[PDB]
Amino acid sequence: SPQVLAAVIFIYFAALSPAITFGGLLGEKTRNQMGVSELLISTAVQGILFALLGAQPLLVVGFSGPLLVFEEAFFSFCETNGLEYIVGRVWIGFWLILLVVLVVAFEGSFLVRFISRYTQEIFSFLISLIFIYETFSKLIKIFQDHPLQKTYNYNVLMVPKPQGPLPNTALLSLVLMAGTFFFAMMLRKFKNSSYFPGKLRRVIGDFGVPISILIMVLVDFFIQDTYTQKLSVPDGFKVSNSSARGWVIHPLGLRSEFPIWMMFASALPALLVFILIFLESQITTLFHLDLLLVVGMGGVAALFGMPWLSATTVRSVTHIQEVKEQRISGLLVAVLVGLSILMEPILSRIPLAVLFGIFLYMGVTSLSGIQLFDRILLLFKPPKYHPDVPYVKRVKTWRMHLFTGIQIICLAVLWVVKSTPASLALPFVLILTVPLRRVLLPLIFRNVELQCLDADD
Amino acid sequence: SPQVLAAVIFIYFAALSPAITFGGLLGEKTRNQMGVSELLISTAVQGILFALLGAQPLLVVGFSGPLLVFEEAFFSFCETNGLEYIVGRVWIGFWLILLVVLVVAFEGSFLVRFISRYTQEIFSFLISLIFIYETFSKLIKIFQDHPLQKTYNYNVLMVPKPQGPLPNTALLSLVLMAGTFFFAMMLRKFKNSSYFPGKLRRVIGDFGVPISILIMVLVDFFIQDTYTQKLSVPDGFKVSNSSARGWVIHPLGLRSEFPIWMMFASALPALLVFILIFLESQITTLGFHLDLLLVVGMGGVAALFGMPWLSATTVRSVTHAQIQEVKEQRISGLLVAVLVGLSILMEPILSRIPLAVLFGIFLYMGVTSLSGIQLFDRILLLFKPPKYHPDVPYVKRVKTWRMHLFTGIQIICLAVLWVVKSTPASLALPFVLILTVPLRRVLLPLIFRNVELQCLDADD
Ligand SMILES: CCCCCCCC(=O)OC[C@H](COP(=O)(O)O[C@@H]1[C@H](O)[C@H](O)[C@@H](OP(=O)(O)O)[C@H](OP(=O)(O)O)[C@H]1O)OC(=O)CCCCCCC
Numbered sequence: 001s002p003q004v005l006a007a008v009i010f011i012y013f014a015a016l017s018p019a020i021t022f023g024g025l026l027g028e029k030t031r032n033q034m035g036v037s038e039l040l041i042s043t044a045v046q047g048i049l050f051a052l053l054g055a056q057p058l059l060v061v062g063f064s065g066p067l068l069v070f071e072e073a074f075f076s077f078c079e080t081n082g083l084e085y086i087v088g089r090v091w092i093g094f095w096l097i098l099l100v101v102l103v104v105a106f107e108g109s110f111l112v113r114f115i116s117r118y119t120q121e122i123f124s125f126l127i128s129l130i131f132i133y134e135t136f137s138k139l140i141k142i143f144q145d146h147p148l149q150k151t152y153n154y155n156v157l158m159v160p161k162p163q164g165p166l167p168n169t170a171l172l173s174l175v176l177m178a179g180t181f182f183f184a185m186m187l188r189k190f191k192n193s194s195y196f197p198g199k200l201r202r203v204i205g206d207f208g209v210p211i212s213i214l215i216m217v218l219v220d221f222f223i224q225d226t227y228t229q230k231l232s233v234p235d236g237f238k239v240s241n242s243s244a245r246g247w248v249i250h251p252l253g254l255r256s257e258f259p260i261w262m263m264f265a266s267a268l269p270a271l272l273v274f275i276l277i278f279l280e281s282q283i284t285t286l287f288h289l290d291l292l293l294v295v296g297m298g299g300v301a302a303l304f305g306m307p308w309l310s311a312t313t314v315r316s317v318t319h320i321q322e323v324k325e326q327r328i329s330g331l332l333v334a335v336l337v338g339l340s341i342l343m344e345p346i347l348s349r350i351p352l353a354v355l356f357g358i359f360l361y362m363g364v365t366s367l368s369g370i371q372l373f374d375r376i377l378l379l380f381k382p383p384k385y386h387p388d389v390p391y392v393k394r395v396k397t398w399r400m401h402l403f404t405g406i407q408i409i410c411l412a413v414l415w416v417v418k419s420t421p422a423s424l425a426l427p428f429v430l431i432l433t434v435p436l437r438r439v440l441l442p443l444i445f446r447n448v449e450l451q452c453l454d455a456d457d
Numbered sequence: 458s459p460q461v462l463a464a465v466i467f468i469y470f471a472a473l474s475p476a477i478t479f480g481g482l483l484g485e486k487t488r489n490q491m492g493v494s495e496l497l498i499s500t501a502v503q504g505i506l507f508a509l510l511g512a513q514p515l516l517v518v519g520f521s522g523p524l525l526v527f528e529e530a531f532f533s534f535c536e537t538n539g540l541e542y543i544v545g546r547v548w549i550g551f552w553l554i555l556l557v558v559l560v561v562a563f564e565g566s567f568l569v570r571f572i573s574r575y576t577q578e579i580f581s582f583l584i585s586l587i588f589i590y591e592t593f594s595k596l597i598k599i600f601q602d603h604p605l606q607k608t609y610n611y612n613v614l615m616v617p618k619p620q621g622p623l624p625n626t627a628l629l630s631l632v633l634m635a636g637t638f639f640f641a642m643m644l645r646k647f648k649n650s651s652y653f654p655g656k657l658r659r660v661i662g663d664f665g666v667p668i669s670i671l672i673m674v675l676v677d678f679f680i681q682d683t684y685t686q687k688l689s690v691p692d693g694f695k696v697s698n699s700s701a702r703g704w705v706i707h708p709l710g711l712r713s714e715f716p717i718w719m720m721f722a723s724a725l726p727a728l729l730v731f732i733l734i735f736l737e738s739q740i741t742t743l744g745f746h747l748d749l750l751l752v753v754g755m756g757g758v759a760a761l762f763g764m765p766w767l768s769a770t771t772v773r774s775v776t777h778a779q780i781q782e783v784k785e786q787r788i789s790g791l792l793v794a795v796l797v798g799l800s801i802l803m804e805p806i807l808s809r810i811p812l813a814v815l816f817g818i819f820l821y822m823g824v825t826s827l828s829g830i831q832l833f834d835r836i837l838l839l840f841k842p843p844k845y846h847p848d849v850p851y852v853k854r855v856k857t858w859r860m861h862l863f864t865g866i867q868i869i870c871l872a873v874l875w876v877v878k879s880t881p882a883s884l885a886l887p888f889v890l891i892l893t894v895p896l897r898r899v900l901l902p903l904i905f906r907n908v909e910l911q912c913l914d915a916d917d
């Protein structure tokens with residue numbers, strides 16, 4: 001039916017664009033041990049399995065910001081400790097399977113009340129700040145690799161990568177990032193604007209990210225001489241690093257023996273991954289069986305070097321017979337995402353600057369709905385300009401600013417922990433905001449102030 | 458007085474930024490025959506004279522878009538016919554003085570009624586479109602001069618001008634233009650926003666253009682290796698092009714004999730200049746006759762020295778905004794003019810201002826000038842569905858297709874004006890625009906009705 005096709009196309013694009021961006025980011029961060037190919041095939045397989053055996057087909061599984069942050073932290077930890085990153089991921093997946101087969105007996109569903117708007121907004125703000133910082137750091141790295149000079153060695157080897165500075169690479173990359181961000185934001189505004197027929201305007205606005213990506217890809221395509229770093233996608237179903245690892249990762253070590261102490265100590269990183277996935281599932285949903293399936297599949301996906309995914313409820317806004325239609329649409333979207341690895345010529349001409357502009361746009365748009373962001377903005381507005389909201393009206397302005405400052409201190413502590421070599425503890429530390437709201441904030445604030453500032457809805 | 462100093466500073470900056478951007482544009486168009494130095498000196502002298510002997514001290518005098526367009530058209534005409542541009546301007550100024558002494562004999566107060574919102578908004582839209590087109594054409598010229606190539610020549614002569622493509626000149630120029638436009642628009646939005654204390658927010662928003670110019674100038678100043686074209690200002694009170702012309706230019710000719718036929722035919726370009734100046738004065742004001750006569754006489758006198766003629770504008774005064782207040786306004790205007798004239802002494806500072814940031818300011822001015830135009834509003838309404846049309850008298854009392862027909866007729870007029878500007882008959886553009894006055898009066902009532910015309914074309 002034509003109804004299924006349009007929704008399938010929309011969801012496929014809205015899942016592929018983040019998938020492509022996160023695959024590029026993962027390939028850059030993890031030295032191409034896990035790239036766009038692995039992320040795409042993992043997303044496809046896990047989406048098919050979740051559609052077939054998921055309680056709620058509305059959920060679509062895919063890589064997210066917190067998972068990328070944890071992958072970067074684990075890669076850095078393995079590099080510092082001289083361990084195999086992929087085998088460590090395999091053992092984390094083993095311990096994740098153990099965790100999911102352990103939680104079912106105890107039914108740890110009472111923790112949902114512990115996670116509140118406090119933790120949810122802190123997590124979302126941290127993720128958006130991480131996105132913005134990653135985009136700006138990539139821009140700085142591009143400008144450092146190819147600085148603005150008057151003389152360049154115009155005969156430089158480029159088979160692995162540019163071995164020296166190049167004239168127009170940095171400025172064109174900055175232009176592409178800025179243009180992608182500007183076009184995506186303008187298309188979003190047009191979707192929220194009052195121009196053009198409503199149906200056509202909404203259709204154009206829904207596809208804002210793919211349209212901006214296509215525009216900037218064409219812009220870079222017609223600039224023939226200038227070199228810009230492109231997305232690294234292998235031709236066919238390949239691991240994107242043949243020298244590094246194969247498809248089926250052998251446990252106990254790939255190039256060197258895996259220590260037993262790491263095998264036993266992989267439980268803690270598995271606990272941190274479970275915490276991250278649980279937090280993402282809670283923020284997307286607002287339930288217990290679907291989380292076990294995703295983490296259980298993530299443990300199996302680690303054996304093949306594939307990443308683990310999360311809940312990421314975005315499909316409900318666009319959407320027994322309805323359940324069957326949703327199941328079929330999700331399965332078709334997953335199949336299309338998997339087959340998107342076949343169009344390697346198309347993906348190999350997508351610059352990384354466009355994807356990082358999309359990353360910045362995603363962070364900026366994620367900042368929009370956060371109440372913590374609203375209060376941070378109110379920190380700069382005069383009190384007369386504060387909106388008519390319960391926390392402004394029923395709480396003193398300095399008390400609300402103190403609440404915002406405490407949340408800012410929490411964000412700063414999380415950022416310091418992430419920058420600290422002990423970045424693997426970033427999930428746990430974030431969950432430490434749960435006792436703070438429960439056992440420490442009531443000491444400073446009152447019940448009414450806490451209810452107004454931190455509310456379920 | 459402390460209150461006088463702040464107003465002087467604000468008006469000085471709001472007059473200097475257009476002064477420097479128009480000086481750069483004139484230096485580009487006229488091959489530095491008239492540049493930043495001449496424009497600044499003319500602006501200072503005419504501002505002092507207008508403050509001392511002007512009926513309305515609120516009026517400010519400076520170069521504007523229509524004057525730049527006419528100067529470009531006259532330069533193109535002179536280069537096509539082989540005439541001397543700077544010497545032809547002398548006879549245009551002579552005929553301007555003749556025109557002002559003729560008009561004072563037969564006071565033409567009836568023409569003010571003829572110019573209406575129709576003509577004034579068509580004029581403003583054409584000027585904004587010209588600004589945007591000039592910025593984009595300069596960007597295209599920059600990208601053509603220094604294309605994005607894999608290999609450039611290591612050493613190229615740059616004493617007269619870069620003789621070949623350069624690595625990062627085009628992309629950095631585009632980045633500077635975009636950044637200047639973005640920062641200016643963001644500061645304009647911040648001025649009307651609800652952040653920061655109201656006094657601080659307003660004073661930050663008022664200085665949006667100087668702040669953006671300073672930010673982008675510093676950004677360029679910290680890119681040591683990359684080259685971008687910068688504003689050309691002589692060290693001291695010097696002619697922009699000493700080889701081309703001196704200070705006092707001989708009316709009979711500088712390097713070639715001036716034809717007598719051109720001496721007599723300079724009346725028509727003088728009439729076109731008078732039409733442009735009158736249209737600008739009518740747009741800004743709505744003593745006007747005396748002010749415009751004084752301004753045109755000063756411009757005709759300044760044409761003897763190779764300096765541009767100015768127009769009447771109230772942008773800076775309105776943005777800043779019984780006998781003692783008038784005296785304070787005169788003193789503030791005189792001080793602003795003196796500071797504008799002394800700005801040439803800051804040659805080291807002005808020589809580090811790229812042309813990309815100035816063209817970004819040009820684009821920002823062109824975009825901002827479209828805010829109050831009803832023609833722009835109806836052009837936007839052409840795309841919005843009729844449900845989303847606002848509660849405006851022409852929306853409610855006129856059928857939507859009739860309003861769109863009105864907008865289409867205005868669009869056709871704008872297209873005709875653009876075609877005339879593109880053709881070698883661009884010198885006739887001031888005349889053709891005045892031809893919209895009969896069209897509204899004698900042709901529009903044939904198609905529309907009295908109520909529709911009064912709602913669409915209203916005085917206020
Ligand atoms: C260069 C491009 C220029 C395009 C021209 C710019 C397009 C343009 O200006 O639209 C004008 C007109 C819209 O008016 P119109 O009211 O008939 O269109 C919609 C219709 O009325 C729906 O019933 C409305 O829903 P609702 O019951 O009220 O709730 C809807 O409102 P909303 O749903 O928005 O709230 C309306 O938008 O439609 C055309 O003629 C397009 C023909 C060209 C075809 C479109 C072009 C592909």
Ligand SMILES: *[C@@H]1O[C@H](CO)[C@@H](O)[C@H](O)[C@H]1NC(C)=O
Pocket residue numbers: 031032033241243244245
């Ligand atoms: C993965 O590929 C990168 C190049 O993309 C290479 O530098 C790295 O050594 C590879 N990893 C291995 C061989 O383990």
Ligand SMILES: *[C@@H]1O[C@H](CO)[C@@H](O)[C@H](O)[C@H]1NC(C)=O
Pocket residue numbers: 488489698700701
């Ligand atoms: C000055 O005028 C001459 C022609 O008389 C021209 O060749 C030269 O380029 C001009 N100077 C500048 C800076 O444009």
